[PDB]
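Inputs:
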Amino acid sequence: YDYHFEVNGTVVRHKNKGFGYMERFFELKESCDERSKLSKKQYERFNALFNFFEKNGVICMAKDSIEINSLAYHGKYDVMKKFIEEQSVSIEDDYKKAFFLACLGRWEESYDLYSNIILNSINGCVYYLSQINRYRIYQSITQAVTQFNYKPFTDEFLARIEREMTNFNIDDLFNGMPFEFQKKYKILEFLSDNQFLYDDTVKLFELTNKVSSDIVVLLRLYDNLRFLYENCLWSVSFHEFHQYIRNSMSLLIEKAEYERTRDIDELGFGFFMEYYDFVNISRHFKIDDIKNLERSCSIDKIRFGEQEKIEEYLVGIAEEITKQFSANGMNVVFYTQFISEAKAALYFAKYVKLSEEGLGKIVKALLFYFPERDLDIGKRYVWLERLTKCNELPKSIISIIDDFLVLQAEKHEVSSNGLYSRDYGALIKHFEKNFISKRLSEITLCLTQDKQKQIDFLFKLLPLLSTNAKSHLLSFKSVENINDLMNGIRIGLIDEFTPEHEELIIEYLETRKVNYIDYMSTFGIWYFLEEINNSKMEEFIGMDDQYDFFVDPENFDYKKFIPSWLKNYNDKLLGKIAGNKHMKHHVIEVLKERVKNSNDKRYLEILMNYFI
Amino acid sequence: LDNNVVECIKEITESSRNGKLVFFVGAGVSTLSDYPQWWRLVDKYHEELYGSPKKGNYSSDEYLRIPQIFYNVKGEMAFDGILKDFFQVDKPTNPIHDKILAMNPAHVITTNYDNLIDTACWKRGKYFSVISAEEDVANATSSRYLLKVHGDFRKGFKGENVVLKEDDYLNYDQNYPLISNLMKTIIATHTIVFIGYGLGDYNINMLLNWVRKLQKDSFHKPFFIRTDPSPIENETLIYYENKGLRIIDAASLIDSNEYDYLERYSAVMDLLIESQENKFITKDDEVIDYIYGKISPLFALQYIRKIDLKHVFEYDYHFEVNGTVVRHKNKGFGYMERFFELKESCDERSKLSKKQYERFNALFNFFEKNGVICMAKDAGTLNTSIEINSLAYHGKYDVMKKFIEEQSVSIEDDYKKAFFLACLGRWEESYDLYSNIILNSGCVYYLSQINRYRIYQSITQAVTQFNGYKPFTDEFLARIEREMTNFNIDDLFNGMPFEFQKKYKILEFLSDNQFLYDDTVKLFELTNKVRSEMSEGSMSSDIVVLLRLYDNLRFLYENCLWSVSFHEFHQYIRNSMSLLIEKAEYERTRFFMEYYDFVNISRHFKIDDIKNLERS
């Protein structure tokens, strides 16, 4: 505590009452003559000290860019495998090898290498750090076994490490080292502690003040990341560090959004995201955390820099996804940690502009080689649609989606979201607007009445077929009764109501009218939407409030209106109701009354975009 | 097992936990690795000088005399050559070496001149300062020793480096003064377990001869692991226990063949190792004794955070903020479940001893005042009722002044008065009172140093604001500076008796901001979760935040800790209350502020924070 060493690289005298040796050192650093006056051995010692202080980002005193050198941090899995394959020349090479094995999911080999280094390492700093990391990898192996209860570790190995690590105390490790080590390496004692990021987490509270701190927080986060990755420490993978990164980045982005909002309020017209920030968010955030960030702050207003580096990182993520799942691959220990980072990276790639080739690689990996368990068809479509935000759909991505749809047809869908293969075709039709699928047409030409599952699958994908394919597909389905007509309209059998469909709807409505003493609401919606021009629906008025609310609002009694109707309405229906020039003030007043009664988010959203 | 055997195991495992266990390893453990025994060397020497093996059996004197006669007659070179050809061998490490190491001995003293213990330590990754010569004592690289009291062959396979012949034993005190002194000091300051010895060994009886010269009950009786095939006789056991030995007989514990030495060693070693996690709690009064031993030091503190109770019991249980206990890592007998069963039903509490009945009464009062209710499976409807018994919390400035003016009955009153002086701004008087409390005192002794350092920090920061009004004289500032620069708060907990560091482990967090770490992390996580649930429109997360807030406030104010004035603590309180108020605002349109919420908002919020809360 003689001096303060700040995150920006400046030194400040703090507590030493003796000579200013750091100020003196900087003075020799500035001027070569004073440096030349040193003795030869002291001159070379000063050269070593200057190299150290340059490497560690210590420049000068107060009166006078992040760069992490780690293959593990940058996700260079192939280069890490190459480094592991080669023969280690030193024990520091073995330490780096054991860290790389830990990061590649090969925890048994990592534990064996750490044990070997501990054997062959008795400064004793690599010995101490291997003891730290072997305990950490032993903790990782122990917790992975509990999660899996697949047998990725043999029971012999588990029993052997349990016997080796029984009664082992990491709290005694530093105190068991020679006192020379304990004096020289007092700064490494925190690595044996259960927690080491409490100071930073408590200091994060300054990002919540509403009355620089943010740059200090970011630089300290970069310092922690560089120390834990460049020194090959396995604590960089545990929940404490990931939680610390999540908290720091989330609070920084929320603080920047708060300053942006306050300035907009007070001035009426902040956070800069770069490659390292993108990698930190991808590796440490879950999808829920990114969703919290998106809902809390406008990430679309955050400028993304170093987009070439981010694109290269995303392409590497896609390539590793392919290598993990195109071939046998499937290191379950590595896959468990890697799939979360890949999901977060592809999810966050919505805000990053991507080149055509890189976008092609990423989209291909996402559509085909991403496991269904981690990303179902609905989540996969959500990721793709997010990818279509910054960059519109080119021809190559449309072709990749076409191949995905062809593969789906050949296979023929469990979707937690509720979006299926039809939405990919809708997305294609959104941009190309005239895309016809050659192979889908070919498989329609081979379709028969036997394979009903194919028919009921790609009847939803009808706009991507040709005229002959559409005509052939239409033959296998009948529209005899009203139920068949409703199944067709929900599946897309007909897009323009024929007069016989109108007669069928009339028959259904008359039959229900006779039996007076779900479908009717849809009929009223279609009548309002000009979908049906029968001009006869007025006789079915009186039963359902929605029916007369939709067929003719002029005579509708708005005391029978339920505000919950608007929640079920879609974008097109709400926009049409807004522009009707009738019914408008009634929905305005009912929505105003609803929101004044209770600040409901969906109702305000409806009232705000289309003004209904 | 016998009761005395279980007691011996208890003390050995406790010393191993405390880091005060030392293993004195004999030739039996090396023989378990098939290391060449000394009688083979005596056999070779006898074949050398005399020309034929001995007809009968070697007496105790002969084992030392024959090598001595060989050394005198045939010289040093032949002696060293036979030593080299017999002892330059590679032998593995038996599981007993690993079992000894797994007990985490502070030091290992051995009469073995082999490197088997060194090989085992190097294989297990245990670093010991190996002392086998006189010059090694001063040049020891660590405070944990592998004390080879009879030397070894690390320098070379010569008789000068080891204690083998009778002249080496005759001149041992003269030739090994530092090593013998270190061995005696390690014996006098540690719990000693003898393994690999025959109860008639020369070293064992020499150590007992030294022991007889010590003052009565001024030393701890060493433990002796006897691994002879036949069980020890009653008379021999009585004699050697009156000589100052606590003997654990392997032959009495288990049944094994005459030559199954490895199994006999392993029985005792495994029973010692497998009892490290054991707590030896079977009957109900053993439950009350253990919980009382864990909780009684906490009686000095007014309140204990429930999140801190998992550290008191070494993560055996989860102590949630709602008052419910959850098994976390208790693989043994459930003492918390048994304690709550005793609490609910008076029948089992009635069948308790008088001392243990009073201990249960104290434990029940402590858990009642601390809000610990029962286990999770028993938990019913629980309310968030908080009370803070502090005059400083409620802003009772006049009552605080009256208490300050009153004469102090005890050091606890002095501590509370110093905290009240700090809360009333009279920082110089509070600092002097804290110094007086430190002088007159160790829970209060440790807490006054933290508070004195915290009040010194507050004094320093306020002086900077005014200069960057003279509340403190320059003489006072100079004196407190002189007293405080040498003081470092990071090593205050380690600069405590080892009893304090174990009884009051939860007080270690008060030195740094590790005290607020778990609550801060939980607050961030629950803020994200609550905001997500609020945005999507869907025990309670708000109740967890409120209960943790109240726990922190009660612990910091009732224990009279100056951390209540910390900027970080104020930020924590402000963030928690802001989240609670946001949730209450959302809960309304589908939680109400009491007096404590009003006081927390007034004390810990800024006007801008309140303005933002009203805006949102």
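The longest strand of chain A covers residues 10-13. Flag for discussion at group meeting.
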